[PDB]
Design an enzyme around this catalytic site. Structure first.
Site, short mmCIF file in Angstrom:
data_model
loop_
_atom_site.label_atom_id
_atom_site.label_comp_id
_atom_site.label_asym_id
_atom_site.label_seq_id
_atom_site.Cartn_x
_atom_site.Cartn_y
_atom_site.Cartn_z
N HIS A 75 11.56 17.64 -35.83
CA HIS A 75 11.10 16.88 -36.42
C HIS A 75 9.05 17.43 -36.22
CE1 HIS A 75 14.22 14.79 -36.91
NE2 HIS A 75 14.30 15.13 -38.27
N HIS A 117 6.38 15.98 -36.19
CA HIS A 117 5.46 13.98 -36.03
C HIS A 117 4.04 14.69 -36.39
CE1 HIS A 117 8.81 11.86 -34.01
NE2 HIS A 117 9.40 13.09 -34.31
N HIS A 158 7.65 10.59 -38.23
CA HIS A 158 7.62 11.69 -38.86
C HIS A 158 6.46 11.58 -39.82
CE1 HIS A 158 11.94 11.79 -38.30
NE2 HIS A 158 11.67 12.41 -36.84
N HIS A 196 12.82 9.35 -44.80
CA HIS A 196 13.78 10.23 -44.39
C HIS A 196 14.26 11.40 -45.07
CE1 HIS A 196 14.39 12.84 -41.04
NE2 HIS A 196 15.71 12.38 -41.02
N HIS A 237 10.43 13.26 -45.41
CA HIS A 237 8.74 12.93 -44.95
C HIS A 237 8.60 14.28 -44.47
CE1 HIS A 237 10.48 9.34 -42.84
NE2 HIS A 237 9.90 9.23 -43.59
N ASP A 268 10.44 16.39 -41.97
CA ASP A 268 11.77 16.70 -42.33
C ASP A 268 11.95 17.92 -42.39
OD1 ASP A 268 11.86 14.04 -41.99
OD2 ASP A 268 11.93 13.71 -43.61
N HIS A 270 14.74 16.35 -30.66
CA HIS A 270 15.82 15.14 -30.25
C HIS A 270 16.83 15.12 -29.60
CE1 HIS A 270 12.46 12.56 -32.84
NE2 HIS A 270 12.44 13.50 -33.02
N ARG A 293 13.22 11.32 -27.87
CA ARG A 293 13.39 12.72 -27.99
C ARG A 293 12.38 13.32 -25.97
NH1 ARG A 293 7.08 9.90 -31.60
NH2 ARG A 293 8.46 8.53 -32.27
ZN LIG Z 1 11.26 12.27 -41.42
#
Ligand SMILES: [Zn+2]
Ligand SMILES: [Zn+2]
Lengths: 153, 153
Positions: free
Chosen positions: B46, B48, B63, B71, B80, B83, B120, B143
């Site tokens: 993702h 961020h 995100h 999400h 997002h 994503d 992740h 993370r």
């Molecule tokens: Zn997201």
């Protein structure tokens, strides 16, 4: 109301955090932060062209210079956009950074977001060293630590 | 033609390099690169919000979500901006990234320059897990590694 941040890391002992803040588009950008592990004295402090850390600080390329000019101090007319001059470390080896600049920006074509800050091995001669290196890098030498300038809260 | 690059480092063994390429404003961004040191399987991948590494990957924030949506995966309507779904690591622990996305950009309002990529711990459930975490992080877990997306040559 822009804000940025930069975490500095290298191979050696040098590290630090630089916060950026710009009230609006036509405003100066204010840097504050601290760097540690520096040898006592002045060290060149520049925004380099690329936020590229694939080969350490080397991949950051040259000082950010969109206008193809020569190296100088922050106060000079002839300067690269990323010419922020020197920061100063005490016997401590600690450097409190506080710089205000009108040439760099956190938005528009002058934007240093996504670029790299590096603190250098030696003092930046501000273009008055009487060689070509001077007009290029200010004779500040090797790149001790660097980070990509990122968007902050 | 815009180019960006991202070097991922974390606390553990997970590292990698993501290259981004967008040939024109109105075009998809094409991610390529490799991440090593992962457990076999899928890991949430993702963008961020913040390029803030002051507190490891934690300081990157949520995100990237300029439109205050929930999400989802890359293909969903509700997602997002950051994503990008999942990446896959073989028995290798090596994940060969190849993603193409039309929602992210390297310029404009959805610009991911100066923000943070993170890989992740767990698989991203694409916001379909029926709990609050899902709607926020896709239950992707901690993370493992991250880096600020920087301007490349
Ligand atoms: Zn997201
Ligand atoms: Zn310069």
């Amino acid at each position: 109301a822009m804000k940025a941040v930069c975490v500095l890391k290298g191979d050696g002992p040098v590290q630090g955090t630089i916060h950026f803040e710009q009230k609006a588009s036509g405003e100066p950008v204010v840097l504050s932060g601290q760097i540690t592990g520096l040898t006592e004295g002045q060290h060149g402090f520049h925004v380099h062209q690329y936020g590229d850390n694939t080969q350490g600080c080397t991949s950051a390329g040259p000082h950010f210079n969109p206008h193809s000019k020569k190296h100088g101090g922050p106060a000079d007319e002839e300067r690269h956009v990323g010419d922020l001059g020197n920061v100063t470390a005490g016997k401590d080896g600690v450097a409190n950074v506080s710089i205000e600049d009108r040439v760099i920006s956190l938005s528009g074509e002058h934007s240093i977001i996504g670029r790299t800050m590096v603190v250098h091995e030696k003092q930046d001669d501000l273009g008055k060293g009487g060689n070509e290196e001077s007009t290029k890098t200010g004779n500040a030498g090797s790149r001790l630590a660097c980070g990509v300038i990122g968007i902050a809260q």
